[PDB]
């Protein structure tokens, strides 16, 4: 039981549990160059046949931010040639783009990168994208949502499989990855970005998680268990929700006769889908219009009113 | 608005949302002597009639741990007199009863305190006990449970009203409580939790939260919104789990054939109920028998075995 099987074990556990790969032939990996993506790439190449995968390629997006961006790219290309993998690289002034598009460098880099990945996925014929997101990212994301404001979705954070994205390392904790990378003497790009605490993610990773571990050494493992519990509870809530939805939402309204009597949790659920919004406040504003007649003005010029035992727009 | 309104609005906001007081006539305040308690009292005394209380009393518990704990008892005795309030003081060797019963000083103090409070409540006839538990406490508890691994149950933390307890400062932030006490030129016992980070709660408070608030200064406000959503969903899951429980349970067993195919989330909550344990592993361990017939052992000699379409506790031992 070494740093390698320890991980492979968790990755196969994910497979059995989530059907991470189930027919996909070509896997494009979002290759940052960092440990995670490296360890990930090593695991997919090893489990390639186990997954019945015809191909595994890397896609590296050069943000043009770090002054090392140019060298890191070259390292990725070399990493690709090394393992004889197809490598597609995209470059875009994340800087400019963020400005001209009033976006923050982060979401902008996210946008341009994912846009690049799809460009390659779609134009080169790969069936999905693999991402090195791991259990610690999951932990960090969830704590970031807990901090910024959230519901189950935030707490659950990302999923092991969503649309064309696959996160094989989902169950793996950073420390295991880091050990894995070591055990197998892998190479990788440094996380310069790391420790700029000015970034919430790093704040959580470097200040919060550490303090939390003084109370629970096994924070990551107990967390994952929390998430699992939450995910099924969430699924049940969403299912039991859709049911209530098309049983009350008839046409362009909501049979308030039925909603009011049904469970608060579900109401907010139905209302959330209908209203198109997801913030606690608005949702709760529309909901009031189930006992208290009237109307309510919300976001993008849209408003809903209560024509007696029905709730529709305006 | 001024610091007074800032707090009272929230206290009334809570009354509306939870019906904190709805008939109780004699309120026993768990009076520590700290701001929360001071402000809680000040506030409840300002709403005495509003809430239709026939009497508000103080109940201070001397843990007998700190040397100051003495001046403290005397403070509450004075405070109580300054307010013309009935107060019930209580000395107890926390340190001694102390975990001779195997339990952290806190655990014991908690026990003895609430024992003492529940004691005063029964003997002197109080309808409930009001605590100074506030929004920052909730935030702290939630993170504590978040940390210690848990589900919605721990995520929700304590409720604003529960059994014989009431927490009027639920929506109130610690800072609002402090601005308030200062604004009203109130006196109170110093905190000191800043010298006991050794305790998880205290660590979350002084070393964790402050950091989270550099990301979102309104963390408390943001946090409250999540609790509201979660409490609802948890209450829903409980209703369902509870129904399914009574549905699948026969005698001292569970009809596997009938539970085996209902939603996972409910299977887990039902096992929990039956099993008498909340640990994920114990629970999954038992769930495994819904499809895989056999036997399983948990902790205190309690072993479950699946007999045909049934799942029961083995009577051995
Ligand atoms: N000396 C005391 N006398 C009476 N009540 C107290 C005293 N100390 C603490 N309490 C009470 O409990 C609150 C203070 O927080 P404390 O009880 O110490 O939190 P905790 O023990 O960490 N867990 P929890 O009780 O659930 O918040 C006050 O609002 C009182 O209700």
UniProtKB/Swiss-Prot annotation, chain B:
Query: What's the EC number here?
Result: 6.3.4.19
| Designated name of the protein | tRNA(Ile)-lysidine synthase
Gene that this polypeptide is encoded by: tilS
GO CC field: cytoplasm
Q: Is the ATP-binding keyword given for this protein?
A: yes
Catalytic EC class: ligase
**Catalysed transformations (reactions):** cytidine(34) in tRNA(Ile2) + L-lysine + ATP = lysidine(34) in tRNA(Ile2) + AMP + diphosphate + H(+)
Q: Where is it located?
A: Cytoplasm
Lineage, opening ranks: Bacteria, Pseudomonadati, Aquificota, Aquificia, Aquificales
* Entry annotated with the keyword ATP-binding: yes
Pfam families of this UniProt entry?
ATP_bind_3 (PF01171), TilS-like (PF22132)
